[PDB]
Symmetry: C4
Subunit: 357 residues, 4 copies
């Protein structure tokens, strides 16, 4: 017989523990006893397996921290609730954790800690994708990578800024996007497999990309005021990654396959199996986002194939090589049927050229 | 032949009398006849006997009372209309009686009349259970019993207090409960065998439990001022009863079987046939209500079987024997298949216990 | 051929003329040929009836009157439009006439023309009965007849009263009832056999009966102050008539057969086939109206058959004659199984009463 | 290969170009290449035809002009986008062109540039009729012809007395009518082959007819204040054409055949096969419109044939000939079955009559 002890604990925290304990006991098909003394709580269980024991202890630790006002205790609680969700077989428990997490996010005000919680939200969405098996949650995993890029930009802001009303605007936008994301995470569990989830997720993705563009402008302005060409290089490399995942998101909303590569001052994407309407909507989204980012493009289209090359500033003598590569990719892709060929073709084009990169 | 009169009466009182006369006359089916006058009535039906005549007399007495301001006349009227309902072959006469009660309740409030009103409402809900066969009326009977026990607390308030703003607040709360119950009674007649009755009755049970907790605190606070250990004993026994009925009510909303026992300082419940979601709701309801009441719980779970027991104020030495007994009750219950065996098993634990007590 | 001139009346009036003139083609798929310019019109037809020419003449005269302020010209026009409607094979022309009647009524203010208008509205509702073939229109015909008897009372008021704010209230009430009746006449053509027609007609009847009661009380109060016992006898007989018709209306809305007789200071009704619910509502309606009128009822129920009789001002001796007659009519009608036999039985009792009246 | 250049333009103008280039690549599916930065764009396409190259060039010229505030550049842009739409394989390109037309019209405040836009709207409605085959678009082509007569009226206002507060009122009316036409075009674009488009078009036609009547008042009042018999002739001869189109428009809501002819001071129409239930709507609409225009109509009908003759006025000795002609045409039309007969019948009557024409 295993036994657990819980003290100074709220009704809210007891609700989590009862959901967990009864959920685990129903999974095990086993007997449970609960005792209370003057509002303290004790729990006893038969034939329990060790990770389920550890999960009850971890839920207990999480709930004991969740009653706190302390933001470090919030970050650790969110990490533990994330571990509980990452183990979870139970949908109502995931729903209740998502609802607790929305409140735990709303507790935070400061970017240094909000980074920890956004990383945890990425893990939450990662598990939610594995739980649902749904391309609508693969979009949420791409939005999580956009948020992870927002966290990397936030860490750059911590590395550089003294604090200002621009940082207050930034953390408000980030916190608001975090709330918009967790509202979509709730909606995905309240209406699984529905078009309204994709509509909300597109409004989320739009809002996130616009926030990213503003964060890039903030960091670029700070880099231009200080003359920091090295920070501007790091940010430039992140611009390419942001557009990469943004393109991945739009392609995934259409449900088409994507392959991608990086080499210093140039980044490449190949997209396969497109059609007229999707291709136009994508190319519109690409050109609008790229124009807002201020990044130099080369693109080519052949109905189902789309090739996108995204570039940092370079000489025209360097841009000639990108112009060559784009036409060379469009030559070499022309007879393939499967992504394992396409990967080898792109690698072959690289192996036929890379000395000039 | 039967003949009756009025000195003066309202048109609504005439409508009740006419509905009663038409009903009692038509019941003979194959031959019926009667006549009226501005202030008189006569019936010519062959087959009618004493109780048919007495029902018209009782309706006429109720009608003569119904126009009055007098609350004693109200209490007598609701009793008479309850006697009419208890005989009634038809629910639309009961709809008229409920519409009258929805007016009659509002006129005034005092604990002694309020008690007889809520008790008569319990009787009307009892007849409504027999007319409908719908367990929402049995649920409402448990709620009305809870309310009636609350008016026994109000009679103890008359036993102990000269009256105050807090007592007038309590009177408003119980008057709201009486209104909310009567609204539920009218709704149940409009929408039998539906979920909206269960939702309204849950909002009644919520308000009722909160009013119970409030009144129990009002009396407990006076008992803690005046040192009244005997009033604490009565209030503790009533607390335990209210919780016992409330747990039975919540289990009856799930439609499961309940068995009950009582020994003063310790009180026992067994519940049979619970689903996963039913248990996960029930045990949280039990916890929140018990922790609001301040009572000392024991709970254990075995899938579809749940055992609950409750105590107050037992020594840390006496608590051991209760917790032993609770674990033993579960150990005894494991092999059972029918309700008579469970009754005999719990009785056997009691019949083995009472030699040592 | 036929040829005519409009002498520069409004184009609104031409709308009616064109509707009528083209309407001539409906009779046989009729070979109408036509010419017009600048308010002069000419027609030729194969086998033209004199009635076609009279309908053209009637439409012309009605159109010529329709621009006028004058109430007598409106009363003449309403009669002509009624005379058109009473020939009409076309229902849209009747809808157009109803749309004009709404405005024609609201223009008018004065008793004699208002009487001819409401009388004509009864004729228009009579034609609506002949067009619909439905007893729903007979309900309106009884209500319109009641209103017409109300304007006969208003003519007795004009014959006697000095004019007052009470008369201005009376005119306003009759105007409202007229517009409510005409709204029901429009609704009968827009939504035939809808439940909304039965709802609107019942509201019209309810409102009209309350206006009847009010006007009957207004005239009775003035006739009491003037001292005219003979005018009070007429008014009381007109009360009894309107009550009699109102009972017939309510029973006809229930869909059941009614038979009627009038015999000076006492009036009689028989109704065949009332359900319990119908008998209950009819008894409520009868009682409420009777107390609002101040009349002495007598009623008996014998299965689905109901007998009603009414009086005022009977001596303590003549009250015995009513009780005798009512008991006897019931006693003989208890063996009655057909309409002509029941008519003969009621006649036989009343013919035998010539030695007692 | 086609290769083309784009100096600085709006992202809307880029969106149009991409919609066009991809919307052309629709046909052959051949490869496309793009290069860009935040102020410049360049495009290249392979295995593409001369007419496709012209469409690309025309879209390029349209995009280059579309950002401009200049009214002449707006007129040319709508003309070019129309010239693209007039060949289009792609429905969404028409949708986008019309959507930007809404704003391109709202930008204009010049009567002659708005006239080129209204002319282009007639062409776009012509293409929309050729795309849909919908009689609701043929109705709109008649509304566009009314708008051409509005344009001709506006050009006569410029020819005579521009710039007054009365002309500013006219400009507001024409701009409102243009907006109402364009919003009706958007509704037809969103929901082809549905009754709500015809109900919207009726509001447009109503406003257009009222605007035409007002423009006729404006010109005729000035013409009377100059004594200008030739301007009175030109305007009155356009009144005939306005009524001619208005008749055809209303008849096209039934979808019936219409034939029309002109000879100096008189204009004639014939309408074939009207069912009575429709004829009663049409004849009334015609007579209402004619009375508002103030023109001396002669209207005739016989069975299902309607003959309309419009006159500006002459002596009774001239009016006799129109009366004779209308009667004779009605006699002559009796036996025909097809429009090639009817044209020749009317032409034969006119060619026999023109000795007094």
């Amino acid at each position: 017989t295993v036994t657990f002890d819980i003290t100074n604990i709220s009704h809210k925290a007891i609700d989590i523990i009862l959901k967990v304990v009864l959920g685990i006991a129903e999974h095990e098909g086993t007997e449970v006893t609960f005792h209370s003394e003057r509002g303290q709580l004790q729990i006893e269980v038969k034939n329990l397996h060790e990770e389920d024991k550890r999960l009850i202890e971890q839920a207990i630790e999480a709930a004991r921290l969740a009653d706190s006002p302390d933001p470090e205790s919030v970050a650790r609680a969110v990490e533990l609730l994330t571990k509980v969700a990452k183990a979870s077989t139970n949908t109502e428990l995931i729903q209740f954790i998502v609802k607790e997490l929305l409140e735990l996010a709303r507790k935070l005000t400061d970017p240094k800690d909000l980074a920890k919680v956004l990383d945890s939200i990425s893990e939450l969405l990662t598990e939610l994708a594995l739980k649902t098996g749904d391309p609508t949650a693969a979009l949420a995993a791409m939005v999580a990578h956009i948020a992870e890029l927002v966290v990397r930009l936030a860490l750059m802001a911590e590395r550089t800024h003294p604090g200002s009303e621009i940082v207050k605007k930034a953390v408000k936008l980030v916190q608001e996007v975090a709330e918009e994301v967790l509202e979509a995470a709730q909606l995905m569990l309240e209406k699984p497999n529905s078009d309204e989830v994709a509509k909300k997720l597109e409004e989320v993705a739009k809002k996130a990309i616009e926030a990213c563009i503003e964060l890039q402008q903030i960091l670029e302005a700070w880099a231009k005021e200080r003359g920091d060409q090295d920070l501007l290089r790091e940010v430039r490399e992140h611009k390419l990654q942001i557009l990469t995942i943004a393109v991945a998101y739009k392609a995934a909303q259409m449900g088409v396959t994507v392959l991608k590569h990086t080499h210093g001052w140039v980044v490449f994407l190949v997209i396969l199996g497109l059609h007229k309407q999707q291709a136009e909507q994508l190319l519109r989204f690409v050109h609008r986002v790229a124009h807002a980012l201020g990044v130099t493009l080369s693109i080519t289209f052949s109905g189902d194939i789309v090739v996108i090359a995204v570039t940092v500033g370079a000489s025209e003598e360097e841009k000639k090589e990108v112009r060559k590569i784009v036409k060379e990719i469009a030559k070499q892709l022309r007879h393939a049927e499967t992504e394992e060929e396409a990967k080898e073709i792109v690698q072959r084009v690289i192996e036929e050229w890379q000395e000039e990169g």
